[PDB]
């Protein structure tokens, strides 16, 4: 597999989004997520994903429970992290991306990377990455 | 004043929070905010703010409109950034912190730094910083 991306918390914050109940992705990715990109990937995002992400790009989808307390949305406990790692050589079947997921204990989750990719094929125009950098 | 903190977007993401209507800070800081700390300040946060932040610490409060569209919370347009810059020498009246605010055009806002500090005095125990680093 891919080793847990130690240090992703200190990478560049790309964007945030909360998926609320009834969202089509709510059952698998419900809650508040933050996206982080490592230094290798950053410039592709800043230029608007017009060229493919270089090999060594790592993108982290950090999913937290969304807690409404009083009149605030707060970050709750981590549910999981999703990872995409670019290596055209290693991952020819999934558009050159390695798809990985880890739970809050940092242990790998048993996922079908092909099922991750199947949805990310919707974003094949921007190298299988949905998110845009929010300045 | 303080020059606009160019490059804060690439600093460490400390935490996020949405203030909803009826929150006591809703009129001035309503929306989704993200907090960023520069490298100088990071370690004080990681150690749980038991010691004061070193001189040269810069913390950014990035406030965005919260847009509910479908069953999602999305980041809307920037409302403002608030900045705290640690310099015990320059800011003896406000606990060694410079308080600054900038609008979306990056232009300074006319604020009373003493009014910022008056509220942050609630957090005098942790060097006038409310937020904790969310691992
Ligand atoms: C559709 C049914 C999806 C499935 C299955 C998976 N992902 Fe995905 N992913 C999806 C969307 C719509 C987005 C964008 C969210 C946003 O805030 O804009 C994402 C994003 C990611 C990211 C961030 C990179 C990006 O493409 O924007 C990563 C690291 C990611 N997803 C990983 C991932 C993994 C590991 C999956 C299988 C376990 C997976 N995704 C499935 C939509 C869908
Ligand atoms: C209470 C009435 C406040 C006034 C007036 C101001 N601030 Fe503040 N600030 C407040 C809280 C409760 C928090 C924490 C928010 C969170 O998500 O936990 C903040 C935070 C900041 C930050 C981030 C650093 C921190 O203390 O956690 C900055 C950079 C900041 N605030 C700046 C700021 C400025 C420039 C103000 C006057 C224009 C100001 N604050 C007023 C509460 C209050």
Author numbering:
A (entry chain A), B (entry chain A): 1 to 135
Q: What's the publication's text?
A:
Other users tend to focus on groups of proteins with homologous functions from a range of microorganisms. This is the case of a group working with cytochromes c′. Furthermore, they pose a challenge as their heme centre is very sensitive to radiation, and thus careful data collection and analysis are crucial. A second cytochrome c′ protein from T. thermophilus (TTCP), in this case with β-sheet fold, presented a greater challenge. Firstly, crystals grow in clusters of stacked plates [Fig. 2(f)], making it impracticable to harvest and cryo-cool without further optimization of crystallization conditions, but the ability to collect data in situ at VMXi made it possible to carefully select positions for data collection around the edges of the cluster [Fig. 2(f)] and the microfocus beam allowed useful datasets to be measured. A full comparison between the RT and 100 K structures was not feasible because the crystallization conditions as well as space group differed.
Here, the current status of the fully automated ambient-temperature beamline VMXi at Diamond Light Source is described, and a highly efficient pipeline from protein sample to final multi-crystal data analysis and structure determination is shown. The VMXi beamline and its associated PXF within the Research Complex at Harwell offer a highly automated pipeline where researchers provide a suitable protein sample that is used for robotic crystallization, monitoring and subsequent in situ data collection from crystals in crystallization plates or in thin-film sample delivery systems. Here we present illustrative examples of data measured using VMXi from a variety of proteins comprising both conventional crystallographic standards and ‘real world’ user samples. Routine RT data collection provides a useful capability that is highly relevant to studying protein dynamics and ligand binding without the complication of cryo-cooling.
